[PDB]
Symmetry: C4
Subunit: 358 residues, 4 copies
Amino acid sequence: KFVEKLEKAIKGYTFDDVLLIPQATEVEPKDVDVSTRITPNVKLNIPILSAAMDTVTEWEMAVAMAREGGLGVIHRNMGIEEQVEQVKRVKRAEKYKNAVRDENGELLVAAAVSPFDIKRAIELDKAGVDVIVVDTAHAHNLKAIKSMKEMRQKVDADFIVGNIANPKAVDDLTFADAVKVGIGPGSICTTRIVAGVGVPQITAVAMVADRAQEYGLYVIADGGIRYSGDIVKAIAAGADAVMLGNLLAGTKEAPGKEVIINGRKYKQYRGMGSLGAMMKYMKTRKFVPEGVEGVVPYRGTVSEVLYQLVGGLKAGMGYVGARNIRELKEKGEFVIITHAGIKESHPHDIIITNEAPN
Amino acid sequence: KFVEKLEKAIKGYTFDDVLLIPQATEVEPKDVDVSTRITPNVKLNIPILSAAMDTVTEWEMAVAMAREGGLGVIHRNMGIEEQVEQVKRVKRAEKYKNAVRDENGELLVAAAVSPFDIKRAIELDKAGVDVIVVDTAHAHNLKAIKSMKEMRQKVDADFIVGNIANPKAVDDLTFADAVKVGIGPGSICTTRIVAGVGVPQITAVAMVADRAQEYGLYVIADGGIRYSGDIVKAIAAGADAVMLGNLLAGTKEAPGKEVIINGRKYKQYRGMGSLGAMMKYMKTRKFVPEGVEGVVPYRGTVSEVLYQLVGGLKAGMGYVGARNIRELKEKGEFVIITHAGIKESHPHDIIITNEAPN
Amino acid sequence: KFVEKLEKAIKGYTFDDVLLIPQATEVEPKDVDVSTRITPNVKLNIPILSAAMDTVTEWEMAVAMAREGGLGVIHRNMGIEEQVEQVKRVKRAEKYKNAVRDENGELLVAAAVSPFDIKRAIELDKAGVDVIVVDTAHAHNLKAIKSMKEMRQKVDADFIVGNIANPKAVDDLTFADAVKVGIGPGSICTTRIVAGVGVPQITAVAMVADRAQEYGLYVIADGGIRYSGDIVKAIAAGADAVMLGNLLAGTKEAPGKEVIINGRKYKQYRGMGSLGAMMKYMKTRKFVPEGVEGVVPYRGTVSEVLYQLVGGLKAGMGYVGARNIRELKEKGEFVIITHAGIKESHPHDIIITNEAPN
Amino acid sequence: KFVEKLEKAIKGYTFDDVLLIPQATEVEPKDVDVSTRITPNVKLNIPILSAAMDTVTEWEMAVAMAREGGLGVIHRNMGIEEQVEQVKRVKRAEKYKNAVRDENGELLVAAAVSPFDIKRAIELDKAGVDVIVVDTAHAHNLKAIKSMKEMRQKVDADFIVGNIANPKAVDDLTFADAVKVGIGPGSICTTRIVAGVGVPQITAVAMVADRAQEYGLYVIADGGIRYSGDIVKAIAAGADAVMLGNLLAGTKEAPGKEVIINGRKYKQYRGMGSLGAMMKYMKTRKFVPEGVEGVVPYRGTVSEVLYQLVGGLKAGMGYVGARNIRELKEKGEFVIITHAGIKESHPHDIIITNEAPN
Ligand SMILES: O=c1[nH]c(=O)c2[nH+]cn([C@@H]3O[C@H](COP(=O)(O)O)[C@@H](O)[C@H]3O)c2[nH]1
Ligand SMILES: O=c1[nH]c(=O)c2[nH+]cn([C@@H]3O[C@H](COP(=O)(O)O)[C@@H](O)[C@H]3O)c2[nH]1
Ligand SMILES: O=c1[nH]c(=O)c2[nH+]cn([C@@H]3O[C@H](COP(=O)(O)O)[C@@H](O)[C@H]3O)c2[nH]1
Ligand SMILES: O=c1[nH]c(=O)c2[nH+]cn([C@@H]3O[C@H](COP(=O)(O)O)[C@@H](O)[C@H]3O)c2[nH]1
């Protein structure tokens, strides 16, 4: 019985365990289309959402994301009235040819809510939020799901529930428009260390994506993205879009506090499940933290970060012969590599003097 | 023949090689029950025992452990009369709703003895010890086992023999109430380096647990636990409880000497098979040490450490839908991960400023 | 579908994942012949080409390479007239018994061109270049290949197209004399990090070599070579020759700028896809860099570096009983090793005071 | 063809990839017998030989080794007359109950020779050397083997040829008494880096041992031993004895020059295939070095080192229920472990203050 648990254990892979195999390419890469659909009513011009964290997304980030064709999810570590005001400021913010707007030409915006905060949801919905993101650590909670269903029935906005890491969870969330995948891969996440629970992101996305495709739900890969190359892999693994925390934290638009150390600029970045975040409107029913607090170097503007990420994604799509997202998901093939392969993949046997992305 | 040894070699896994897969959860996590049975007459309120080491468990630790629902095993690197006095002080120590007590309302306590120290055992038994723990490096020793049987017949207390790492050893220990698993995983253990013998803990627990279940014996996972997440994995692998050395060392109650270095507080922690421990009542028939001496940072009180560990265990059980220990052992499923997966599981690509567990 | 991508994923190996198994040897090693054919009209006396990079190969490097029996590929990050002049200076440069010369006794030389630069190619061809090397990041580009075919028809020089990492690409390049293998292994390469695309070099060379052999095309392993041992492995994996960047950079003949740091000598080495290289005649249609800038320690003269590399290759060939290149490719057998095996393969448990290669 | 080389590649294991599984033990460990036979006329009281290196074995080391029941192999980086004198001094050196002596009560001694130095061999034989050790990097050399056969016919001493790493080599060396296994694992060895050739030691010993057993030849595992635990594994893998360089270097008896750095004592240790060793009577037909030069910390006397090593071996044998060497080779079973398992096997999550072996 216990030995069979080990013998039958599935083998899980993360971003660094795989590489995409180059293929014949007819069109690339400057002509690559990266638009993608995440909900019945929402198609982004770039497959990127900014995390719903208090050191990542507030109104400024959301405006910047929407102007670039992406989407910002206003965090919920604030009062309901404060969150509705953030949403309104974004919707009325409008040179940005890639911007994603609603029927009235207003920038799109999303906002996070707890599975039980139906009041908050309705207020956000009335404020004109385009997407409601049920933001929980383990969405496959029955009681929570019952509350989610009631919530879905009382709002018009599109509905995204996350996070999950087991395909079986999709079967009980078919009332949502999309599911967010990611349990334990976050840069500031300690859930796997504290709880011992999780699934390597590439494997998690693939398992969930196959099940989601069966029900008509979209998939968002959340957490663990460190390089543009990870985005290409996530999409090839089945995701329609990715959600970034670390890579967007430290940008001018990020609400994280500035920090200088040794003359170098940084910005705070912390898990919403950290003491600091808890010491700020959520009160989780958790006895111990599952996130840490840290800092990331100053990255410049959101615009500059997205240009690099999207640039890399387009290069990767060109290399595999994918003219659009659907084709990447369709024909992207993987090769599994070893630790030594990981080392050779990064720059090696050299004293780097400049790694600039321009 | 020799090549077949390699071809037929079993693949062994340790804590970091696996993760638990999230599942549908109906009740969690603050309502999770972590009580567990380790012997016919002993059920703990938390699945944790403090190691029988001279830098970990003496009367103060044992009192603190029992008051929290756990169990302390008084070490045997002292005289018989000194050990009986430690036991008595614990039994008469009694605001602690989770405390584990015997029929007379006295805190429970355990004590270690050598497989050959029948005299010590009888004295401990008369002093009212609740559990006698035969404490040896390799319990699957025939001569030792013969002595153990005679010992079991002369004491009333429950009987725990360890340590072992091969299921075949259980077959010859069916006269005991439970077996302790762990050969080589300890934080200060060098047995695998000095002797070249051992079995990765997750695999060892699983193999032994399947065999133990066939005979009605309980299983305790001893050594190698560094995080609360490891506890969840050990139990899911077949263990009824775990034994901690490193994580309890450095607490206020631990008998280890205090040490200050660079203004920072530490406490000594060393293997019982180290020169220091040997230079203190045991005299092993070993030519060379199989343990080292070191220090661990000050952790605070036992109460604070247990709260965190149990907190993590409850979070993990909630994530897999386990309302109690039996269900964790019953339905916990694993996913095997690579080194890259291990890296992504811990916090990464961030300059940590705070990892506090509150 | 997505899960099958992972289940059917091929396992890729790089240089450090393998070792060659020693065999009975009748002749070795000072009598080992390392000559090798890379094109219908070109056989080198040593299986080594210098990279077409602006910090590696200009006329001096090319002269040194040809004098030792190797081949230099003049980089294309300069004007057409400048490149033709570099070529002419090499052809007229002529104590060097291993030198490779053309029919008129002139040192051989190669030059790189973009798949679309037919003008540059014709000029190089008229200048007497022996080999034209189509130098692109992803040669399996249809539009590029159409241009390549027109180019092949307008020049007399031998034709080498690269780089590729998929055997399927060979099928569409049968009009060339040889293909260059290598996508992502370079010491200063970030293509796998930025685009997420690539194939571990040993696996890439083997897959391509089997397909190339079917069409009569030669194979050159480009990138990732750090030690002479890697050369032996690359050839045993199917390559006819290797191309070096890092190992030749830092030599007296390399055009890289000199840099002193802490009294120690270095020379600049950077990817052609780096800002620095771009800031120098190419203008790629890439949005972001896929190479970095760094420095390598001063290595001495090209002659000294080649002696060591070739020395190692000959030792390795002797150990496997290969009197020539054809036999190495023919009978070289591999054993796959683990990370621990990699550690034991390098010097260990010692404080090195001298690693000199004389 | 090339892809099949990878698909059919055998998987090789080194010491750190495996652990021995504990078993029922009837007698251990102070009653463990570690005597072992390495040749028809030579049985050692401990399975250890000192390397034939100029920084490891000269007459003092050989005397110390024989007095402890082991064997010293006088290195050949000296003149013939100097080597014969070293041998004589050992034979006439004679409180040492474990000493290994010949028929006349003289300490045993071995000496190394090149496969072609028949003159040196005969002189050593006449001087009374007990074992002649043909000392070469790749013994599976036909020309060398022909010379070896002539040598075997002109000496009375027992004959040991090494090193090899392929079982096929044993088939051509059946005229010898034993073969020495080890190509590339040495602490100061770079053969695998320079030549790309080698076989992980555990796998090499096992493959060779199975073939050797078929012909009646003994096996000596040479190189890569860092801990007593490695000795237990090597023997369990099929070896009759092991040869140590690094672990014996740095002892009082070792001829290596003393070196002080930061108040700490060290002794030089270098490969015989290093410039330093070459700059000292061998003149190899190698173009480049395959060994490095370094230093090891002062270890104390040979006696103290052997006590620890043998102590560990006995502990390991007790843990697996082996009362003697034959039984270890007979019933020792392995479990393969991962990198994480390797980490847990060593001391972890502790600040070591003392690792003393007493
Ligand atoms: O287990 C967790 N404990 C936390 O405290 C925490 N905070 C954020 N997150 C999630 O991490 C995602 C961002 O991941 P990255 O920084 O790698 O982009 C985000 O999308 C969040 O989903 C957490 N997960
Ligand atoms: O091989 C060993 N040599 C030793 O000297 C030694 N000292 C303690 N122990 C065992 O390690 C366990 C505690 O392990 P942790 O520190 O990882 O919690 C404890 O439960 C002890 O079983 C030893 N094992
Ligand atoms: O992806 C890349 N981005 C770059 O900027 C770049 N620059 C050079 N190269 C290629 O790397 C090869 C040299 O590799 P080594 O330094 O390891 O010898 C060379 O042969 C080049 O093919 C690049 N690849
Ligand atoms: O490839 C090699 N190049 C060298 O220069 C060299 N020097 C010593 N040896 C061999 O290494 C063995 C000692 O290995 P350890 O230091 O790990 O005990 C010894 O037994 C020697 O066989 C060499 N191998």
